[PDB]
Amino acid sequence: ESQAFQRQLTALIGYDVTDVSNVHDDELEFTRRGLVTPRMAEVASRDPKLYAMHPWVTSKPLPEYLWKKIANNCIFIVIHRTTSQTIKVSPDDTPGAILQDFVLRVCGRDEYLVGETPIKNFQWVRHCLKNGEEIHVVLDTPPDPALDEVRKVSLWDCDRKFRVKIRGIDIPVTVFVEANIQHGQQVLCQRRTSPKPFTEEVLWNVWLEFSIKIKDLPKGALLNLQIYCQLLYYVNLLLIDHRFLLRRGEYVLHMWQISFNADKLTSATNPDKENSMSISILLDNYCHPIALPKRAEMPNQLRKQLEAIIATDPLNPLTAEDKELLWHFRYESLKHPKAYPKLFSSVKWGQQEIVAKTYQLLARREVWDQSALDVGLTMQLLDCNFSDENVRAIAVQKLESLEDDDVLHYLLQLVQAVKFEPYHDSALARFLLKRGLRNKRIGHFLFWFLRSEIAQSRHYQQRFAVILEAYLRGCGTAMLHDFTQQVQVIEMLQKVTLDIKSLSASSQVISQLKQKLENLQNSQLPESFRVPYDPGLKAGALAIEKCKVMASKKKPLWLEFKCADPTALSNETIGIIFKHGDDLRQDMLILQILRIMESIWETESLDLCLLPYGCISTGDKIGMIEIVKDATTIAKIQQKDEVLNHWLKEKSPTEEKFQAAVERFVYSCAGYCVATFVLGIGDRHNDNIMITETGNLFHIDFGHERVPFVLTPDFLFVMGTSGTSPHFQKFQDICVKAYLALRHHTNLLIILFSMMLMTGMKEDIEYIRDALTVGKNEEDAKKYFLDQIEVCRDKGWTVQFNWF
Ligand SMILES: COc1ccc(Nc2ncc3c(n2)n([C@H]2CC[C@H](O)CC2)c(=O)n3C)c(C)c1
């Protein structure tokens, strides 16, 4: 009766937040009640009308390539009733002015054209102009906001050295315990136990005294415990808790098993108590509670040394000379905004006096607050290397400036950045909540980004579940209903995917698939649901006739659905692929960097025609993918030079379209050539590369003799070259222009890649350093990328054959 709402959330989240079996403290519960106020703050402040209609707008300028589509400075928009009427409108006109009570909704979508923004600033308009599609809208009644209703003694006095006694270990299946006092990634001090023979139970009952004092312990200090037989098991314990108190008492911590990573810094313990290793520890308990409280100019040559350090990439290491120089001239380093990540690495966190000096420094935020928002720099202070709550907070405040559109660009990476946070109720977690509760699109993707990690990562499911419950308790009854219609479908369809995969090592499989879905369609399944990757799109009834099982090494479910919106322009079905086997969380990350790459090029007035298809990971190596209409594989066309160009002319009806297809190929090919090379996912097979009948080429399957990228003689013949051509010159020109544009955002791409490698996947990250050629000049870099084209031209088909 009363607890029916919590059980409703538990089914949506995929984890029971009310469960307190895998906890040793009230951390998750304190953060649950602490997340009430920021949720209430956004629910009360948000506009009912604007939130219900969720307008997707951008304050960014209109691109140079998109102005070419608007003739005589007036675009055409058609308003529907049975009857339609075309209206010529200026790009600077507001929807109300075109309206001359009634809303302008997109035909066949849940996207609305409202607010004090011009038509050129609407994301749907910029999309229609790109693909060369007519802007079709319908005079609708505004959606009711009532559908979105919401249901309702000092530590610095302790001069004694820190110690912790390791009682023993226990496993049902030579060894020693490695104790570490960690702050981020840096180890303050290390102490190891005597090596005793490895058995079922190994007791020590000995105190491990550290060099660090109680006074010198910082906020967010971790007690890293490691088992070496070499490394086998790991576990962590936050020494200074969420209530600013030094931990006390007996603890039995279940350790995570191995075989660097975001999964190592986790405060959460192993839920598998009947199969994992455990550790018994005791912390010095006291009667009184121990709580934690709250110039001259640089010379010419030394300034040249300091400015050189700030100028280097985020991966370049800081020596003792570098760290001491940055800390001594911290006030001059404070003047430079790019110096902040390198400066906050130069500070001794295991020293009470030094940490206090970092706080009085940070107080003079006069230059940081006034500085231009650098997302690369902002994200830099949110990684594994930064664990001070106050240092991480100065980055989160800069993210507040970021508009809704740009929040969507980095939403996935910001969600993964929570893994690097020492405590649960953090500024970043509170930020993701507020931005998710303000905008329906941000909140929708937030739900799926959180639900993806909960379903797989047991290391962070407890943390992400309390963030999802906090979002879910303010998204409104309308979204809560939609999220259930989505969950019910994705869960029922995940069952069929794993069932069909188990039945295959044909006529039998396709007849059994059509059997399994038919009885599901005429049962408890919803009549309509929202597409997790395209929330504007709404899929209805299953097209059982068009449903099939794909023929590959894995057995995915090719599913087709009729559109729920009857105001849709075409009767075209929605295609969704349910695939098990590959890690879709990796595909999710690469596709996001690809979307960022498109925005990076947009600011530089470039359009490299990338196709970043929809992909949402739902469970254990299982999720959904977008079916790209009128698109096939390169290997499918082969099942050698003329073969690809002939397919383009065959699928082209008029010469007007084939001359457009060759241009659509030149941009899309060069775009994926640059993108895949930078991220180190360029040496791929024809089966993992696709092309549309419109000429748009795109890379697929990012589930983890050599060549930098794919530029085979079948593609070069489309351009008209054999081992120059007017199209090939256009290709190399845009290849240089696109590569040069990404080098202007090196630190962004370095920090995006570094995070991806830690949350999704040391020497491996070092790849982008050479790929984006750090240290070299713009003219020197031009020759490097042109030489990579020459490697592809010399190799040709040699690499493609080698893939067995
Ligand atoms: C994460 O990888 C994926 C999976 C499916 C799609 N969508 C998709 N739409 C239409 C397709 C298609 N795939 N394929 C594949 C099947 C998988 C195989 O590996 C390659 C060929 C086709 O033959 N047609 C006609 C994408 C864009 C990426």
PDB file of N, CA, C and O and ligand atoms in Angstrom, residues 548 550-553 556 558 575 577 579 582 584 587 591 611 613-615 624-633 636 686-690 698-703, ligand 1:
ATOM      1  N   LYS A 548      13.251 -10.743 -37.889  1.00  0.00           N
ATOM      2  CA  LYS A 548      14.168 -11.837 -38.231  1.00  0.00           C
ATOM      3  C   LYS A 548      15.372 -11.942 -37.277  1.00  0.00           C
ATOM      4  O   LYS A 548      15.583 -11.056 -36.449  1.00  0.00           O
ATOM      5  N   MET A 550      19.491 -12.218 -37.273  1.00  0.00           N
ATOM      6  CA  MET A 550      20.646 -11.917 -38.121  1.00  0.00           C
ATOM      7  C   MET A 550      21.648 -13.070 -38.188  1.00  0.00           C
ATOM      8  O   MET A 550      21.886 -13.743 -37.182  1.00  0.00           O
ATOM      9  N   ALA A 551      22.227 -13.290 -39.383  1.00  0.00           N
ATOM     10  CA  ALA A 551      23.208 -14.344 -39.644  1.00  0.00           C
ATOM     11  C   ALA A 551      24.650 -13.834 -39.499  1.00  0.00           C
ATOM     12  O   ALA A 551      25.198 -13.221 -40.421  1.00  0.00           O
ATOM     13  N   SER A 552      25.250 -14.078 -38.321  1.00  0.00           N
ATOM     14  CA  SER A 552      26.625 -13.692 -37.977  1.00  0.00           C
ATOM     15  C   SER A 552      27.204 -14.703 -36.958  1.00  0.00           C
ATOM     16  O   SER A 552      26.632 -15.790 -36.799  1.00  0.00           O
ATOM     17  N   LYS A 553      28.338 -14.371 -36.287  1.00  0.00           N
ATOM     18  CA  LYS A 553      28.924 -15.244 -35.259  1.00  0.00           C
ATOM     19  C   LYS A 553      28.037 -15.228 -33.994  1.00  0.00           C
ATOM     20  O   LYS A 553      27.954 -16.229 -33.278  1.00  0.00           O
ATOM     21  N   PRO A 556      21.797 -11.766 -33.236  1.00  0.00           N
ATOM     22  CA  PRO A 556      20.989 -10.598 -32.862  1.00  0.00           C
ATOM     23  C   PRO A 556      19.561 -10.661 -33.390  1.00  0.00           C
ATOM     24  O   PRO A 556      19.267 -11.399 -34.334  1.00  0.00           O
ATOM     25  N   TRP A 558      16.724  -8.763 -35.290  1.00  0.00           N
ATOM     26  CA  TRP A 558      16.322  -7.690 -36.199  1.00  0.00           C
ATOM     27  C   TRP A 558      14.815  -7.536 -35.987  1.00  0.00           C
ATOM     28  O   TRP A 558      14.045  -8.429 -36.350  1.00  0.00           O
ATOM     29  N   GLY A 575      13.275   0.251 -37.039  1.00  0.00           N
ATOM     30  CA  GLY A 575      14.120  -0.927 -36.928  1.00  0.00           C
ATOM     31  C   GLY A 575      15.066  -0.848 -35.750  1.00  0.00           C
ATOM     32  O   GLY A 575      15.807   0.131 -35.618  1.00  0.00           O
ATOM     33  N   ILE A 577      17.875  -3.422 -33.410  1.00  0.00           N
ATOM     34  CA  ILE A 577      18.657  -4.657 -33.282  1.00  0.00           C
ATOM     35  C   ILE A 577      18.991  -4.915 -31.806  1.00  0.00           C
ATOM     36  O   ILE A 577      19.603  -4.066 -31.163  1.00  0.00           O
ATOM     37  N   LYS A 579      21.238  -7.102 -29.551  1.00  0.00           N
ATOM     38  CA  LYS A 579      22.446  -7.926 -29.682  1.00  0.00           C
ATOM     39  C   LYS A 579      23.152  -8.251 -28.368  1.00  0.00           C
ATOM     40  O   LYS A 579      23.410  -7.354 -27.563  1.00  0.00           O
ATOM     41  N   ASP A 582      28.894  -8.671 -27.569  1.00  0.00           N
ATOM     42  CA  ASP A 582      29.822  -7.538 -27.527  1.00  0.00           C
ATOM     43  C   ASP A 582      29.467  -6.552 -26.413  1.00  0.00           C
ATOM     44  O   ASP A 582      28.302  -6.474 -26.010  1.00  0.00           O
ATOM     45  N   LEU A 584      28.508  -3.156 -25.381  1.00  0.00           N
ATOM     46  CA  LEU A 584      27.855  -1.977 -25.949  1.00  0.00           C
ATOM     47  C   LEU A 584      28.184  -0.679 -25.201  1.00  0.00           C
ATOM     48  O   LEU A 584      27.984   0.401 -25.759  1.00  0.00           O
ATOM     49  N   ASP A 587      30.891   0.770 -27.177  1.00  0.00           N
ATOM     50  CA  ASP A 587      30.267   1.324 -28.385  1.00  0.00           C
ATOM     51  C   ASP A 587      29.610   2.663 -28.072  1.00  0.00           C
ATOM     52  O   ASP A 587      29.681   3.579 -28.886  1.00  0.00           O
ATOM     53  N   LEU A 591      30.967   6.298 -29.798  1.00  0.00           N
ATOM     54  CA  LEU A 591      29.890   7.022 -30.480  1.00  0.00           C
ATOM     55  C   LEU A 591      29.721   8.414 -29.893  1.00  0.00           C
ATOM     56  O   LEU A 591      29.369   9.338 -30.622  1.00  0.00           O
ATOM     57  N   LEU A 611      27.999   9.371 -39.174  1.00  0.00           N
ATOM     58  CA  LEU A 611      26.690   8.798 -38.858  1.00  0.00           C
ATOM     59  C   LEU A 611      26.732   8.104 -37.466  1.00  0.00           C
ATOM     60  O   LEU A 611      26.915   6.880 -37.398  1.00  0.00           O
ATOM     61  N   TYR A 613      25.005   6.488 -35.078  1.00  0.00           N
ATOM     62  CA  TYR A 613      23.762   5.745 -34.857  1.00  0.00           C
ATOM     63  C   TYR A 613      23.436   5.565 -33.365  1.00  0.00           C
ATOM     64  O   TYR A 613      24.320   5.671 -32.512  1.00  0.00           O
ATOM     65  N   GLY A 614      22.169   5.296 -33.078  1.00  0.00           N
ATOM     66  CA  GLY A 614      21.691   5.080 -31.723  1.00  0.00           C
ATOM     67  C   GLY A 614      22.114   3.739 -31.168  1.00  0.00           C
ATOM     68  O   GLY A 614      21.989   2.712 -31.842  1.00  0.00           O
ATOM     69  N   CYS A 615      22.643   3.754 -29.932  1.00  0.00           N
ATOM     70  CA  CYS A 615      23.105   2.571 -29.209  1.00  0.00           C
ATOM     71  C   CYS A 615      23.032   2.787 -27.705  1.00  0.00           C
ATOM     72  O   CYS A 615      23.716   3.664 -27.169  1.00  0.00           O
ATOM     73  N   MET A 624      20.494  -2.515 -27.245  1.00  0.00           N
ATOM     74  CA  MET A 624      19.838  -2.215 -28.518  1.00  0.00           C
ATOM     75  C   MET A 624      20.616  -1.230 -29.401  1.00  0.00           C
ATOM     76  O   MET A 624      21.274  -0.312 -28.906  1.00  0.00           O
ATOM     77  N   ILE A 625      20.538  -1.462 -30.723  1.00  0.00           N
ATOM     78  CA  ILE A 625      21.207  -0.696 -31.777  1.00  0.00           C
ATOM     79  C   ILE A 625      20.165  -0.215 -32.808  1.00  0.00           C
ATOM     80  O   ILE A 625      19.114  -0.840 -32.973  1.00  0.00           O
ATOM     81  N   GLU A 626      20.469   0.900 -33.488  1.00  0.00           N
ATOM     82  CA  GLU A 626      19.639   1.519 -34.517  1.00  0.00           C
ATOM     83  C   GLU A 626      19.840   0.832 -35.870  1.00  0.00           C
ATOM     84  O   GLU A 626      20.983   0.609 -36.279  1.00  0.00           O
ATOM     85  N   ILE A 627      18.735   0.525 -36.578  1.00  0.00           N
ATOM     86  CA  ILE A 627      18.813  -0.033 -37.929  1.00  0.00           C
ATOM     87  C   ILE A 627      18.892   1.157 -38.874  1.00  0.00           C
ATOM     88  O   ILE A 627      17.979   1.991 -38.898  1.00  0.00           O
ATOM     89  N   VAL A 628      20.004   1.262 -39.609  1.00  0.00           N
ATOM     90  CA  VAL A 628      20.199   2.355 -40.553  1.00  0.00           C
ATOM     91  C   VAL A 628      19.531   1.957 -41.870  1.00  0.00           C
ATOM     92  O   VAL A 628      19.960   1.005 -42.529  1.00  0.00           O
ATOM     93  N   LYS A 629      18.425   2.651 -42.196  1.00  0.00           N
ATOM     94  CA  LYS A 629      17.608   2.422 -43.387  1.00  0.00           C
ATOM     95  C   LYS A 629      18.379   2.735 -44.674  1.00  0.00           C
ATOM     96  O   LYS A 629      19.094   3.740 -44.738  1.00  0.00           O
ATOM     97  N   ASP A 630      18.237   1.850 -45.685  1.00  0.00           N
ATOM     98  CA  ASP A 630      18.906   1.909 -46.992  1.00  0.00           C
ATOM     99  C   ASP A 630      20.437   1.939 -46.841  1.00  0.00           C
ATOM    100  O   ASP A 630      21.111   2.782 -47.436  1.00  0.00           O
ATOM    101  N   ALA A 631      20.971   1.014 -46.015  1.00  0.00           N
ATOM    102  CA  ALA A 631      22.397   0.876 -45.722  1.00  0.00           C
ATOM    103  C   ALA A 631      22.831  -0.591 -45.620  1.00  0.00           C
ATOM    104  O   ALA A 631      22.143  -1.400 -44.992  1.00  0.00           O
ATOM    105  N   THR A 632      23.977  -0.924 -46.245  1.00  0.00           N
ATOM    106  CA  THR A 632      24.559  -2.269 -46.234  1.00  0.00           C
ATOM    107  C   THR A 632      26.063  -2.212 -45.909  1.00  0.00           C
ATOM    108  O   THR A 632      26.650  -1.129 -45.865  1.00  0.00           O
ATOM    109  N   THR A 633      26.667  -3.386 -45.673  1.00  0.00           N
ATOM    110  CA  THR A 633      28.082  -3.552 -45.340  1.00  0.00           C
ATOM    111  C   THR A 633      28.955  -3.525 -46.594  1.00  0.00           C
ATOM    112  O   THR A 633      28.470  -3.845 -47.683  1.00  0.00           O
ATOM    113  N   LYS A 636      29.439  -7.065 -47.807  1.00  0.00           N
ATOM    114  CA  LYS A 636      28.207  -7.531 -48.450  1.00  0.00           C
ATOM    115  C   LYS A 636      28.229  -7.199 -49.944  1.00  0.00           C
ATOM    116  O   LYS A 636      27.804  -8.022 -50.761  1.00  0.00           O
ATOM    117  N   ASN A 686      36.120  -5.009 -43.383  1.00  0.00           N
ATOM    118  CA  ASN A 686      34.991  -4.588 -44.231  1.00  0.00           C
ATOM    119  C   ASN A 686      33.624  -4.876 -43.604  1.00  0.00           C
ATOM    120  O   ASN A 686      32.671  -4.143 -43.868  1.00  0.00           O
ATOM    121  N   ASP A 687      33.540  -5.934 -42.769  1.00  0.00           N
ATOM    122  CA  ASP A 687      32.332  -6.343 -42.053  1.00  0.00           C
ATOM    123  C   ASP A 687      31.937  -5.327 -40.960  1.00  0.00           C
ATOM    124  O   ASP A 687      30.766  -5.272 -40.574  1.00  0.00           O
ATOM    125  N   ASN A 688      32.911  -4.532 -40.466  1.00  0.00           N
ATOM    126  CA  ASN A 688      32.693  -3.513 -39.437  1.00  0.00           C
ATOM    127  C   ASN A 688      32.590  -2.081 -40.013  1.00  0.00           C
ATOM    128  O   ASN A 688      32.588  -1.108 -39.252  1.00  0.00           O
ATOM    129  N   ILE A 689      32.480  -1.961 -41.354  1.00  0.00           N
ATOM    130  CA  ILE A 689      32.332  -0.687 -42.074  1.00  0.00           C
ATOM    131  C   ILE A 689      31.080  -0.775 -42.963  1.00  0.00           C
ATOM    132  O   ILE A 689      30.921  -1.740 -43.713  1.00  0.00           O
ATOM    133  N   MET A 690      30.193   0.228 -42.857  1.00  0.00           N
ATOM    134  CA  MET A 690      28.934   0.290 -43.604  1.00  0.00           C
ATOM    135  C   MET A 690      28.826   1.525 -44.501  1.00  0.00           C
ATOM    136  O   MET A 690      29.588   2.477 -44.334  1.00  0.00           O
ATOM    137  N   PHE A 698      29.966   4.820 -42.853  1.00  0.00           N
ATOM    138  CA  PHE A 698      30.030   4.848 -41.387  1.00  0.00           C
ATOM    139  C   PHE A 698      30.536   3.548 -40.773  1.00  0.00           C
ATOM    140  O   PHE A 698      30.156   2.470 -41.222  1.00  0.00           O
ATOM    141  N   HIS A 699      31.378   3.663 -39.729  1.00  0.00           N
ATOM    142  CA  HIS A 699      31.958   2.540 -38.984  1.00  0.00           C
ATOM    143  C   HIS A 699      30.976   1.980 -37.956  1.00  0.00           C
ATOM    144  O   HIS A 699      30.239   2.746 -37.331  1.00  0.00           O
ATOM    145  N   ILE A 700      30.972   0.644 -37.779  1.00  0.00           N
ATOM    146  CA  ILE A 700      30.091  -0.072 -36.840  1.00  0.00           C
ATOM    147  C   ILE A 700      30.884  -1.023 -35.920  1.00  0.00           C
ATOM    148  O   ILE A 700      32.083  -1.207 -36.141  1.00  0.00           O
ATOM    149  N   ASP A 701      30.209  -1.626 -34.905  1.00  0.00           N
ATOM    150  CA  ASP A 701      30.753  -2.589 -33.928  1.00  0.00           C
ATOM    151  C   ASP A 701      32.073  -2.153 -33.283  1.00  0.00           C
ATOM    152  O   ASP A 701      33.149  -2.514 -33.764  1.00  0.00           O
ATOM    153  N   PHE A 702      31.991  -1.389 -32.192  1.00  0.00           N
ATOM    154  CA  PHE A 702      33.180  -0.907 -31.494  1.00  0.00           C
ATOM    155  C   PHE A 702      33.521  -1.742 -30.242  1.00  0.00           C
ATOM    156  O   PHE A 702      34.191  -1.250 -29.329  1.00  0.00           O
ATOM    157  N   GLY A 703      33.105  -3.014 -30.248  1.00  0.00           N
ATOM    158  CA  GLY A 703      33.348  -3.966 -29.167  1.00  0.00           C
ATOM    159  C   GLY A 703      34.785  -4.448 -29.122  1.00  0.00           C
ATOM    160  O   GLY A 703      35.059  -5.616 -29.420  1.00  0.00           O
TER     161      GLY A 703
HETATM  162  C1  LIG B   1      26.978  -2.156 -33.099  1.00  0.00           C
HETATM  163  O1  LIG B   1      26.976  -2.560 -34.473  1.00  0.00           O
HETATM  164  C2  LIG B   1      25.898  -2.266 -35.264  1.00  0.00           C
HETATM  165  C3  LIG B   1      24.909  -3.227 -35.474  1.00  0.00           C
HETATM  166  C4  LIG B   1      23.815  -2.930 -36.276  1.00  0.00           C
HETATM  167  C5  LIG B   1      23.688  -1.671 -36.888  1.00  0.00           C
HETATM  168  N1  LIG B   1      22.570  -1.380 -37.703  1.00  0.00           N
HETATM  169  C6  LIG B   1      22.321  -2.050 -38.899  1.00  0.00           C
HETATM  170  N2  LIG B   1      21.339  -1.648 -39.709  1.00  0.00           N
HETATM  171  C7  LIG B   1      21.089  -2.286 -40.860  1.00  0.00           C
HETATM  172  C8  LIG B   1      21.871  -3.390 -41.216  1.00  0.00           C
HETATM  173  C9  LIG B   1      22.893  -3.779 -40.333  1.00  0.00           C
HETATM  174  N3  LIG B   1      23.079  -3.096 -39.212  1.00  0.00           N
HETATM  175  N4  LIG B   1      23.531  -4.875 -40.871  1.00  0.00           N
HETATM  176  C10 LIG B   1      24.664  -5.525 -40.180  1.00  0.00           C
HETATM  177  C11 LIG B   1      24.325  -6.571 -39.110  1.00  0.00           C
HETATM  178  C12 LIG B   1      25.523  -6.722 -38.151  1.00  0.00           C
HETATM  179  C13 LIG B   1      26.847  -7.006 -38.900  1.00  0.00           C
HETATM  180  O2  LIG B   1      27.939  -6.977 -37.975  1.00  0.00           O
HETATM  181  C14 LIG B   1      27.124  -5.985 -40.024  1.00  0.00           C
HETATM  182  C15 LIG B   1      25.932  -5.841 -40.989  1.00  0.00           C
HETATM  183  C16 LIG B   1      22.931  -5.168 -42.056  1.00  0.00           C
HETATM  184  O3  LIG B   1      23.237  -6.081 -42.809  1.00  0.00           O
HETATM  185  N5  LIG B   1      21.924  -4.285 -42.288  1.00  0.00           N
HETATM  186  C17 LIG B   1      21.038  -4.270 -43.463  1.00  0.00           C
HETATM  187  C18 LIG B   1      24.681  -0.707 -36.678  1.00  0.00           C
HETATM  188  C19 LIG B   1      24.577   0.657 -37.316  1.00  0.00           C
HETATM  189  C20 LIG B   1      25.774  -1.009 -35.873  1.00  0.00           C
END
